[PDB]
Write an enzyme that holds these catalytic residues in place. Structure first.
Site, short mmCIF file in Angstrom:
data_model
loop_
_atom_site.label_atom_id
_atom_site.label_comp_id
_atom_site.label_asym_id
_atom_site.label_seq_id
_atom_site.Cartn_x
_atom_site.Cartn_y
_atom_site.Cartn_z
N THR A 85 -9.15 -0.31 4.01
CA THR A 85 -10.17 0.23 3.13
C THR A 85 -9.97 -0.32 1.73
O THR A 85 -10.89 -0.86 1.11
CB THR A 85 -10.10 1.75 3.12
OG1 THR A 85 -9.02 2.16 2.27
CG2 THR A 85 -9.81 2.24 4.52
N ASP A 386 -4.11 7.90 9.53
CA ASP A 386 -4.37 6.47 9.44
C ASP A 386 -3.52 5.70 10.45
O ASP A 386 -3.99 4.72 11.05
CB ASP A 386 -4.10 5.97 8.03
CG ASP A 386 -5.32 6.07 7.13
OD1 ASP A 386 -6.39 6.49 7.62
OD2 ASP A 386 -5.21 5.73 5.93
#
Lengths: 518, 41
Positions: A85, A386
């Site tokens: 990201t 994550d």
């Protein structure tokens, strides 16, 4: 030649580009093994720490729309990959910067977009070429991928213990054969304040944040579990009802008989042989009555109130016990069994439920998160999520890439030579594209405190015959074969990053003006 | 002096958990490098 009359479109494009670049540079710090997290204070008065970009941007209340598209980009990447990201947004920023360069470089944006499409095609081809196929069954490569993703957030503190945590959890939840995209919501996360992050624990079982309701029963062994939905109280019909009292024996007949009804309920419950009770919310009407609690405690049955309706599917998946919604269907056939279940005591007096060991092994699994600060716990759970995401990504494509920007410089080199080969203004476009990809290693060196330009140039020179295995190393502070330093991320991560960024930049180039509304 | 002779004693868990939590706090706060403020709604 043709004349350009208006300039408002170009100016608004420039404004958007500047905004995007500023946002990119703002994120730029938090990145990579040397990543530095940020903190955001909510106007509500809430405080959060974060290193992951997506949470940062969601906490951003960005004004300029372009960066809002960027935030949305990051959201999509996270719902796809989990890290990068940061990487994908920084690529977006660099791309738009080169887009500026190309705008005063006079080329119409549409050609830029088409050339970018060619560029991403070349890049995807190269990335697919460079990877290393890896079977899902090899634990150690999984572990390396984990610790690769992990040592970029705060939880690198206990990375050594957190990585096996995540990998074991995922292995227990997947089907190791179908290579499907096993859901993350099958993994339960528990934010429990207090303790130490080191004391984070896996529970191959079920954990409920609620508390017991029986005074006297704390631990049960060889417990048989049953989950029940229908309330245990005075019978209250769906439609309006009421007892009428007009006579003499009515009083005691009532009292005696709701007692008898509750007694029948509890007596059948015991006759099934159950000893641990689960009751869901019934906010619409009566919950478990107190009198029934008295009976159950008298009969020595573990009991729990207030089970959220959304948790019921997870619970029945985990402990392997279909619920029961009427008396008759409640039968020893359906009573689930677990090796042990009881109420642990942590937090000094913050008490928690564990059910370890189940003869019917549910594919789901849970995670207990410990640590001192509330904020650090939230960041840790983000990072663990994550990690699970990146493992799932690896499941999606059994391909592996050494991280550390080496894929990106590989991309820059190959794309630059490709642009040299390919003529037209698209050549200039692609050269800009490669110079855009050049950024990630520069940021890595910068946050590594190394001379960025010298390092990047030397790393390209090495990589001219020093293929993707070599790259930027943090621990030695120089350039080495990263693969042997065991820092690898799945292909899908950077692939999705590049694809999403390219589509967003094309879309941005389509834009010319912004109109205020009602 | 000698606190062992003097009787000045503390439980181990005090210092242990203390140092651990202090380390965690230092890790959390030190990793900061920027706050972004939002005036309320």
């Amino acid at each position: 030649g043709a004349y350009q009359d208006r300039d408002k479109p170009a100016q608004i494009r420039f404004s958007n580009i500047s905004a995007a670049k500023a946002v990119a540079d703002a994120i730029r710090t938090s990145l990579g093994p040397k990543g530095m997290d940020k903190m955001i204070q909510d106007g509500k008065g809430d405080v959060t720490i974060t290193n992951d970009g997506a949470t940062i941007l969601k906490q951003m209340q960005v004004l300029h729309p372009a960066a809002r598209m960027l935030v949305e980009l990051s959201k999509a990447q996270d719902i796809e990959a989990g890290d990068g990201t940061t990487s994908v947004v920084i690529i977006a920023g660099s791309l738009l910067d080169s887009c500026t360069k190309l705008l005063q470089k006079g080329i119409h944006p549409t050609i830029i977009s088409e050339s970018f499409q060619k560029a991403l095609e070349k890049g995807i081809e190269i990335l697919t070429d460079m990877s290393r196929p890896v079977e899902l069954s090899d634990r150690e490569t999984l572990l390396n991928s984990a610790t690769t993703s992990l040592n970029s957030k705060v939880v690198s503190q206990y990375s050594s213990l957190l990585s096996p945590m995540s990998v074991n959890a995922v292995m227990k939840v997947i089907d190791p054969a179908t290579a499907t995209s096993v859901d993350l919501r099958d993994i339960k996360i528990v934010k429990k304040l207090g303790g130490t992050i080191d004391d984070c624990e896996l529970v191959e079982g079920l954990v409920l944040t609620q508390k017991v309701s029986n005074s006297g029963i704390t631990r049960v062994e060889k417990a048989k579990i049953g989950l029940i939905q229908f309330c245990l109280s005075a019978p209250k019909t769906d439609m309006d009802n009421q007892i009428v009292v007009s006579d003499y024996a009515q009083m005691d007949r009532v009292l005696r008989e709701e007692r008898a009804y509750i007694l029948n309920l509890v007596k059948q419950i015991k006759k099934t042989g159950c000893n641990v009770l689960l009751i869901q919310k019934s906010i619409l009407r009566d919950a478990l009555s107190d009198l029934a609690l008295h009976f159950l405690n008298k009969m020595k049955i573990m009991v729990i109130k207030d089970i959220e309706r959304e948790d019921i599917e997870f619970i029945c998946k985990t402990i392997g016990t279909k619920p029961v919604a009427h008396i008759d269907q409640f039968t020893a056939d359906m009573l689930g069994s677990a090796e042990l279940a009881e109420e642990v005591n942590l937090n000094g007096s913050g008490k928690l439920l564990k059910i370890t060991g189940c003869a019917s092994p549910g594919k789901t699994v849970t995670i207990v998160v410990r640590g001192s600060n509330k904020l650090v716990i939230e960041e840790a759970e983000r990072s663990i999520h994550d990690a699970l995401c990146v493992i799932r990504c690896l499941v999606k494509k059994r391909a592996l890439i050494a991280g550390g920007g080496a894929p990106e410089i590989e991309l820059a080199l190959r794309l630059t030579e490709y642009s040299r080969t390919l003529s037209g203004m698209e050549s200039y476009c692609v050269r800009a594209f490669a110079d855009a990809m050049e950024v990630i290693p520069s940021t890595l060196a910068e946050n590594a405190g190394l001379n960025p330009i010298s390092t990047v140039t030397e790393l390209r020179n090495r990589h001219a015959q020093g293929e993707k295995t070599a790259g930027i190393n943090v621990r030695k502070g120089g350039i080495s074969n990263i693969l042997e330093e065991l820092v690898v991320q799945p292909l899908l991560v950077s692939v999705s990053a590049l694809t999403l960024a390219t589509e967003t930049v094309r879309s941005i180039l389509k834009i010319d003006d912004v109109v205020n509304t009602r | 002096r000698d606190n062992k002779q003097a009787g000045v004693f503390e439980p181990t868990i005090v210092k242990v958990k203390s140092l651990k939590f202090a380390t965690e706090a230092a890790i959390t706060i030190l990793r900061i490098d920027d706050l972004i403020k939002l005036h309320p709604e």
